[PDB]
């Protein structure tokens, strides 16, 4: 009948604790029982690989839907806890009254073992750990005002968490959807693009227009939090709103009529940052979401469902083919509607890419009240979202490779774009290799050249703004374009989207919130290094996807799998030739890439933006503008950045920042610890274990689960894990400790 219908099987899986007591039930091999320690590790590594646990897409699909509900439940509990801790263990009320002086804190340590030192004198007759997630600013923007409200949102969160968990159980054990239900992309996109995003934005705009905007205006004006009317009061008494925004008097009459102009009071396109709080005007944010909402809702009506009108994605994809691309995009629809791994690849890459964009756009255009001046929170958020993004992007590549090895079928892909790509893979990889070498030699060479020149007493031969100069002309041009846009290419706007492009210095509380950021030779040099790092990462990852099934070296790599240790010592050596290993190596380069980016942000900002400005025009940046002539050499980074900005962590003992010092050291230890897994091999360890077991046997006792050394692949994984934790952890402490002081 209808193309789109709901098909669900009742009572699919019985709920019992029997399987719980039978570890390894999901796998046929593991189910037999443990005979060596490898079984234990394998149990945990194959837990969520449903494709290998079952051969039916319906079953795999059912598990994924329910598992997702589980994650949602966890996320809800997390958010709930944060709000609760902000209601019972925080100084929000005090901060709300004096946001500039009091420091945000929402965690308190018990008075055990001198750990109390960690409870700092943040302010407002309160002692606790200074948090840096930015909760206080967000709550202020929403218009919380009280701590009772925080408690209630916490309760809502707990309730929501439970509902999600029930949903997971219900849709797996009692009402499990069939495969036909899952395979309805057009419907899903229509619903998610119009309901989840469109209605979501519209609903949020409602809160912002009726509750947040009014309260925040009063707060900024000076009204004491206690004197601001309760949220419900604004919703009921239109007169009160009319006082603040003199258009609510007209009511919704202007809206139904075409006179949307009358609502210019609260819907505006001002641009720039609020002078008092140093954040984007909420009026603009309200119009933003309202506009986006309309767009999304309209977009949700593009695909056919059950009424004839609409587009069928298959047709659109197949029609787009050209002279240089054979059958074009034929075959892609089936792949994306019959392979979860393929979908995850695209989705995961885009999600990670978004996080990186959020990081850039959220510092240049501060979105929350009193966020820019809080340097600690700004740095924390930028770095946090930069990382999340990197991991996700690499993950997308990984799952893309899993697709090629597990779901790719030659029959369904003849002369399509995918086939043609795999037919000239040598050309693609060869060229990218060259691009990477070119960029790397030229970009890093600049730094080495400068180091040598400065050391040889020849400063006039350096690539600097005072010698041979490499100016970023293109970027400088775009900046000017964006600066002059308000009033020209953007006539109805009133100010620059960001003061970074150009403008005046916005200061809040004697501290600089935003200032024009200029680009010179040093910036050129660093930006091109970023390009090199990203390009190399792509090379490793793309090579893995393209050569996943076969290679000149190992023609039958596909049969070996996605995660095999090697093929042997032959052919000169075939170690680490799997696609999994390419992901393994890619993560190391992603670490390098992100590390450089976050360091660039930290030094540039502390040198050319952040700081204090006097009543008159005197700007004193935190580091003093050293970036221009010091970041052009490697010695400069080691001395004027790492060595100098690390004075805080190393001298944190005896203070509330002591934890960071300990973690800094601990992270270094873990990083080094990992190098033993990354440089050694299973053979040595297995033999050592044999001798150790001899001792236990000599005393008449030994485990039946014979002790064995970690697999080759696991060894690499353990090493990478500790390596990443240690490296990121070290910077984490370094940044946070430094930031607390600079703030």
């Amino acid at each position: 009948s209808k193309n789109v219908q709901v098909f669900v099987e009742k009572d699919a899986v019985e709920t019992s604790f029997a399987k719980w007591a039978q570890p390894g039930h999901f796998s046929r091999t593991l189910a037999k029982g443990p005979k060596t320690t490898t079984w234990i590790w394998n149990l945990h590594a194959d837990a969520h690989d449903f494709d290998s646990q079952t051969s039916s897409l319906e079953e795999v699909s059912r598990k994924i839907f329910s598992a997702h509900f589980g994650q949602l439940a966890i996320i809800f509990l997390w958010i709930s806890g944060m709000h609760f801790h902000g209601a019972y263990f925080s100084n929000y009320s005090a901060w709300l009254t004096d946001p500039i002086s009091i420091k945000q804190s929402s965690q308190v340590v018990w008075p055990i073992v001198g750990q109390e030192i960690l409870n700092a004198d943040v302010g407002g007759n309160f002692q606790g750990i200074q948090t840096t997630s930015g909760w206080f600013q967000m709550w202020r923007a929403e218009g919380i005002t009280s701590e009772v409200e925080l408690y209630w949102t916490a309760i809502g969160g707990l309730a929501m968490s439970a509902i999600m968990l029930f949903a997971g159980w219900f849709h797996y054990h009692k009402a499990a959807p069939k495969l036909e239900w899952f395979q309805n992309a057009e419907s899903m996109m229509n619903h998610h693009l119009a309901g989840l995003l469109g209605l979501g934005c519209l609903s949020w705009s409602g809160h912002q227009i009726h509750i947040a905007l009014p309260i925040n205006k009063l707060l900024d004006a000076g009204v004491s939090p206690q004197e601001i009317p309760l949220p419900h009061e604004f919703l009921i008494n239109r007169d009160l709103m009319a006082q603040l925004y003199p258009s609510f008097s007209k009511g919704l009459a202007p809206f139904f009529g075409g006179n949307w102009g009358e609502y210019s009071d609260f819907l505006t396109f001002k641009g720039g940052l609020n002078p008092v709080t140093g954040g984007l005007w909420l009026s603009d944010i309200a119009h933003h979401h309202l506009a986006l909402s309309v767009l999304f809702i309209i977009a949700g009506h593009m695909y056919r469902t059950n009424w004839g009108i609409g587009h069928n994605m298959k047709e659109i994809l197949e029609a787009h083919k050209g002279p240089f691309t054979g059958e074009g995009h034929k075959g892609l629809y089936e792949i994306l509607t019959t392979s979860w791994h393929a979908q995850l690849a695209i989705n995961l890459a885009m999600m990670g890419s978004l996080s990186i964009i959020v990081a850039h756009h959220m510092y240049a255009m501060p979105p929350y009240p009193y966020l820019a001046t809080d340097y600690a929170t700004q740095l924390s958020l930028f770095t946090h979202h930069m990382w999340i993004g990197g991991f996700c992007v690499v993950g997308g590549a990984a799952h893309g490779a899993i697709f090629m090895v597990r779901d790719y079928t030659p029959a369904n892909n003849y002369n399509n774009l995918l086939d043609r790509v795999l037919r000239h893979r040598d050309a693609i990889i060869s060229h990218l290799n060259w691009v990477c070498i070119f960029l790397g030699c030229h970009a890093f060479g600049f730094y080495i050249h400068n180091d040598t020149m400065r050391a040889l007493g020849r400063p006039q031969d350096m690539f600097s703004d005072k010698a041979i100069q490499l100016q970023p002309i293109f970027a400088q041009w775009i900046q000017n374009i964006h600066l002059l846009a308000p009033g020209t290419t953007a006539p109805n706007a009133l100010a620059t989207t960001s003061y970074a492009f150009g403008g005046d210095v916005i200061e809040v509380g004697g501290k600089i919130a935003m200032m024009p950021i200029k680009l010179g030779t040093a910036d050129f040099m660093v930006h091109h290094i970023h390009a090199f790092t990203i390009h190399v990462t792509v090379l490793i990852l793309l090579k893995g996807v393209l050569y996943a099934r076969s290679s000149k070296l190992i023609p039958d790599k596909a049969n070996l799998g996605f995660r095999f240790p090697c093929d042997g010592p032959g052919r000169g050596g075939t170690c680490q030739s799997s696609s999994w290993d390419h992901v393994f190596l890619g993560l190391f380069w992603m670490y390098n890439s992100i590390s450089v980016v976050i360091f660039h942000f930290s030094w540039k900002m502390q040198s050319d933006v952040w700081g204090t400005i006097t009543p008159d025009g005197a700007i004193s940046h935190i580091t003093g503008g050293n970036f221009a002539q010091s970041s052009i050499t490697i010695n400069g980074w080691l001395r004027d950045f790492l060595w100098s900005q690390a004075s805080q962590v190393i001298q944190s003992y005896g203070s509330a920042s002591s934890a960071y010092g300990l973690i800094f050291l601990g992270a270094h230890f873990i990083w080094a610890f990992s190098l033993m897994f990354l440089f050694s091999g299973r053979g040595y360890w297995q033999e050592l274990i044999e001798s150790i077991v001899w001792a236990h046997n000599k005393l008449n006792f030994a485990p039946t689960i014979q002790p064995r050394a970690l697999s080759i692949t696991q060894g690499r994984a353990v090493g990478l894990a500790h390596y990443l934790l240690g490296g990121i952890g070290t910077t984490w402490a370094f940044f946070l400790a430094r930031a607390i002081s600079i703030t």
């Binding site: 060869s430 060229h431 090579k543 050596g573």
Partner: protein
């Protein structure tokens, strides 16, 4: 690099480079007499250990000398 990255990856990459040289005009005129191949397993281990060792000694040598001389001399 030599210690953590192993042969398989590099061998495949070198193969692509061979293809390029043989297919790029002008450079085709010149050719090798010893087939280009990746370093062996043990060789890489040795090369890596040497790089690690040389850097280790050199860095400390500078510190012990510059630090002592710069302060007391």
């Amino acid at each position: 690099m030599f210690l953590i990255s192993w042969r398989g990856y590099w061998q495949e990459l070198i193969e692509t480079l061979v293809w390029a040289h043989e297919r790029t005009p002008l450079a085709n005129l010149i050719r090798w007499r010893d087939k280009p191949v990746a370093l062996s397993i043990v060789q890489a281990r040795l090369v890596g250990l040497v790089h690690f060792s040389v850097g280790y000694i050199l860095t400390y040598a500078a510190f012990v000398i510059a630090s002592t001389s710069g302060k007391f001399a």
